[PDB]
């Protein structure tokens, strides 16, 4: 009826009064419409949806990349499918091979998963928290040191930043 737009049209359950033609949501966008020939109500849903991130090892080393689709669950709305599809609680990762080891985080993907440029290709793994250890606790056992080490460590702290001034008229 002259109102233009873009989106996906689906059958609706809303039911208009006879003096109504369009339906609006809280952001005041038209989200429902009555078809002027069949008199049926339709819902209008937008077309773009879902975040995308790109994981690179740096283009000074390679132009291989992996892509994380943060709203897809494959078990699609993807640009490519390639190989090495790996599902994560942060989304579907495409272009990186899943391994069973665990290292320190290199590139944080999220939800406990990191990625790195190892063997060349891109691998994705679950980050390790640290080495496992156990204390030999008993009710009558103690451990006493017999030597020592003198350690020297550095700690860096910022104290100032640059002082600037601006001339409004000149800018």
């Amino acid at each position: 009826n002259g109102l233009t737009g873009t989106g996906v049209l689906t059958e609706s359950n809303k039911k208009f009064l006879p003096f109504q033609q369009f339906g609006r949501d809280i952001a005041d966008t038209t989200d429902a419409v009555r078809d002027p020939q069949t008199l049926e109500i339709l819902d209008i849903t937008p077309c773009s949806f879902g975040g995308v991130s790109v994981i690179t090892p740096g283009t000074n080393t390679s132009n291989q990349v992996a892509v994380l689709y943060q709203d897809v669950n494959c078990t699609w709305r993807v640009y490519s499918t390639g190989s090495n599809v790996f599902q994560t609680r942060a989304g579907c990762l495409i272009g990186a091979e899943h391994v069973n080891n665990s290292y320190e985080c290199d590139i944080p993907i999220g939800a406990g998963i990191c990625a790195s440029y190892q063997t060349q290709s891109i691998i994705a793994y679950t980050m390790s928290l640290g080495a496992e250890n156990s204390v030999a606790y008993s009710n009558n056992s103690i451990a006493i040191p017999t030597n020592f080490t003198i350690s020297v460590t550095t700690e860096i702290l910022p104290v100032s930043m640059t002082k600037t001034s601006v001339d409004c008229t000149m800018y």
């Binding site: 030999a136 009710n139 009558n140 056992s141 103690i142 451990a143 006493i144 040191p145 017999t146 030597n147 020592f148 080490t149 003198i150 350690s151 020297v152 460590t153 550095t154 700690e155 860096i156 702290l157 910022p158 104290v159 100032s160 930043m161 640059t162 600037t164 601006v166 409004c168 800018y171």
Partner: protein, 195 residues
């Protein structure tokens, strides 16, 4: 000398990037016909060039405002960092700290300051125990129906004999009446031993 001071370089990088972003934002039209005042003032006469100049003025004013706001926020963070550095200077360099992990990892012995571009570096000298050894231990010693507790140490045993040592360095000594003190009898302490 080998290979960094990333936390001190990020400050310089951030300030430089902010100024350069200000400079490149002079290429925005903000909804005017051009971003150059000399293309507007030539080809347009005062009353109808004023609308375009007003658009440019509003845009550039809000650019300056954004810069100043983000500078204030960053200055608050640097202020917090400088307050922490002053506290560390008074408590780790001008004294000896009992606060855990405040002046390094280990038991703090001393600290030395060094100046760096826009910041400070602390060299923390700490004491780290090493080469520990297992011993059998006991809370108290029972001698004459009396319980003896160590004064400033702990009771250990090399397997057959009992000594009293200091907690942070193995230096065994014979249990005497100058190492211990008496309190009560031998019926209340749980893991008391005879010696």
């Amino acid at each position: 000398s080998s290979t960094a001071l990333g936390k001190l370089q990020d400050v310089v990088n951030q300030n430089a990037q902010a100024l350069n972003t200000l400079v490149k934002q002079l290429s925005s039209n903000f909804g005017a016909i051009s971003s150059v005042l000399n293309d507007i003032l030539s080809r347009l006469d005062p009353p109808e060039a004023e609308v375009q100049i007003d658009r440019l003025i509003t845009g550039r004013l809000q650019s300056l405002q954004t810069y100043v706001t983000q500078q204030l926020i960053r200055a608050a963070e640097i202020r917090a960092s400088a307050n922490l550095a002053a506290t560390k200077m008074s408590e780790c360099v001008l004294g000896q700290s009992k606060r855990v992990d405040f002046c390094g990892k280990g038991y703090h012995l001393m600290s030395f300051p060094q100046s760096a571009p826009h910041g400070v570096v602390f060299l923390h000298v700490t004491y780290v125990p090493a080469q520990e050894k297992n011993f059998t231990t006991a809370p108290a010693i029972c001698h004459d129906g009396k319980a003896h507790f160590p004064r400033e140490g702990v009771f250990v045993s090399n397997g057959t004999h009992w000594f009293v040592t200091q907690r942070n360095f193995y230096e065994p000594q014979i249990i005497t009446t100058d190492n211990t003190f008496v309190s009560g009898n031998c019926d209340v302490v749980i893991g008391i031993v005879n010696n």
